[PDB]
């Protein structure tokens with residue numbers, strides 16, 4: 001008789017561990033434990049969401065005839081940790097085998113690997129069939145090509161899945177439609193609202209418990225709208241197909257002060273805990289393309305994010321090992337500035353995106369990359385500090401998908417290891433791709449003076465102090481040509497003004 005453990009990001013009735021259990025003999029185990037709610041200061045909505053999806057997933061299995069042992073975060077004898085809770089079940093149920101799908105973070109794998117030695121019982125750790133690449137396939141694909149790019153990997157995934165494939169060639173005779181393409185942003189009022197799901201009896205009781213036990217944690221619980229059931233996630237899926245998919249590629253890089261969502265799917269939360277399955281999400285997009293419902297560039301652009309980037313980040317996470325988090329190519333040591341936790345700044349773009357994060361635990365891609373992520377980079381923040389923030393604040397964050405986005409893509413803390421170019425940009429970009437500057441106190445056209453946006457001076461300071469590590473980068477080559485053309489006292493004034501702002505952040509970091 002078997003003890004099946006299921007982790008909080010594995011809430012799927014065909015997870016690897018349920019393959020061939022005996023509903024009479026065996027016992028599924030789920031547990032809310034303090035070790036996983038507290039290894040980082042998660043956003044309140046993140047904890048509430050995960051807890052509520054677990055309690056709902058527990059009810060799901062029970063209705064399907066499974067023996068389910070559930071341990072609540074506040075239960076009397078809660079042991080506090082996976083190891084502890086599995087121990088309590090072993091004296092309780094005395095199984096002859098523990099079954100578990102492989103976890104999604106290094107830390108958790110560490111604990112899972114200590115099970116067998118610590119309990120003297122067979123532990124069967126199963127590989128996670130939700131992912132198209134095993135660790136073994138990806139390692140071997142990476143070996144025999146000393147340069148890693150998503151594009152060459154994504155090519156393989158299209159072949160392997162047959163998604164958007166005419167047997168042997170890609171639909172429309174291009175793997176990529178990057179893009180068909182761009183163009184400025186519009187506050188389209190004739191745009192449907194993204195779905196919201198009002199909290200039920202379970203979710204309300206978890207909302208109350210989270211506010212009682214994690215009172216000093218990041219984020220507001222008000223306006224909880226996440227789907228916590230499988231049915232509601234599949235409704236979030238079909239609403240995106242029906243209402244937003246056909247404009248996905250059009251508005252992809254745009255930011256609107258008044259539109260936190262535009263045309264994105266808002267599914268990462270569900271895909272990443274098993275409520276939605278990645279390959280089914282992709283097939284629905286493709287099914288919609290063949291029924292005329294969206295253009296080729298929106299669908300391929302959308303599938304590219306899932307079977308391309310998300311699958312590739314996972315691969316990069318395990319390939320790089322646990323100390324990838326120590327990557328600090330630029331040798332930064334500055335603390336994460338204070339307003340990342342308060343939203344209280346006069347940089348209108350930083351204030352909007354951080355306020356959105358506070359209140360919804362969501363911000364879409366270009367926001368994570370070019371607002372908060374770009375500022376961190378230019379300001380020279382310790383990448384470990386940035387990594388903690390991104391893992392804590394967003395309700396779709398687990399280390400495997402967060403860490404390579406932060407270290408590799410955003411902060412370039414690994415010197416371009418995962419193939420991307422560096423995303424440093426001045427306030428010229430933000431003015432082009434948003435309306436944030438319109439109501440901002442600074443001017444995105446000024447570099448010096450009391451009301452220049454600090455992204456401008458910080459942009460050039462960042463190129464100037466790291467010139468040695470970046471001069472050979474055929475992407476910054478034009479900026480450096482622009483730098484050298486500036487008179488000497490101008491380059492001096494820009495770097496002094498960069499320092500004045502840098503000083504103002506360090507002064508604040510000291511008061512705490």
Ligand SMILES: Cc1cc2nc3c(=O)[nH]c(=O)nc-3n(C[C@H](O)[C@H](O)[C@H](O)COP(=O)(O)OP(=O)(O)OC[C@H]3O[C@@H](n4cnc5c(N)ncnc54)[C@H](O)[C@@H]3O)c2cc1C
Pocket residue numbers: 263264265266267268269271272302305306309310311313363364365366368369373390391394396397398401402405406409410
């Ligand atoms: C600094 C930084 C931190 C990030 N942290 C996370 C994170 O913690 N969790 C997370 O899931 N994504 C993360 N991303 C990737 C991306 O920003 C999010 O997937 C996206 O915001 C999810 O929103 P959505 O579901 O509306 O995406 P959409 O724009 O609707 O994208 C469609 C789907 O593609 C997937 N996807 C898109 N981009 C990526 C990517 N770069 N890597 C992996 N999957 C992707 C998501 O599953 C998403 O649901 C991060 C990106 C950056 C630049």
Ligand SMILES: Cc1nc2c(=O)[nH]c(=O)nc-2n(C[C@H](O)[C@H](O)[C@H](O)CO)c1C
Pocket residue numbers: 006007008009031032033036037038042046047050102103104105108398399
């Ligand atoms: C906040 C939180 N709480 C739990 C929990 O109570 N029980 C659980 O099984 N999982 C939780 N998780 C997700 C895990 O910490 C971890 O990040 C995933 O297991 C990734 O493999 C999270 C993120």
Ligand code: SF4
Pocket residue numbers: 347348349350427430431436437438440441442443444453454455
């Ligand atoms: S000006 Fe520079 S600072 Fe003010 S919003 Fe535009 S970008 Fe943010």
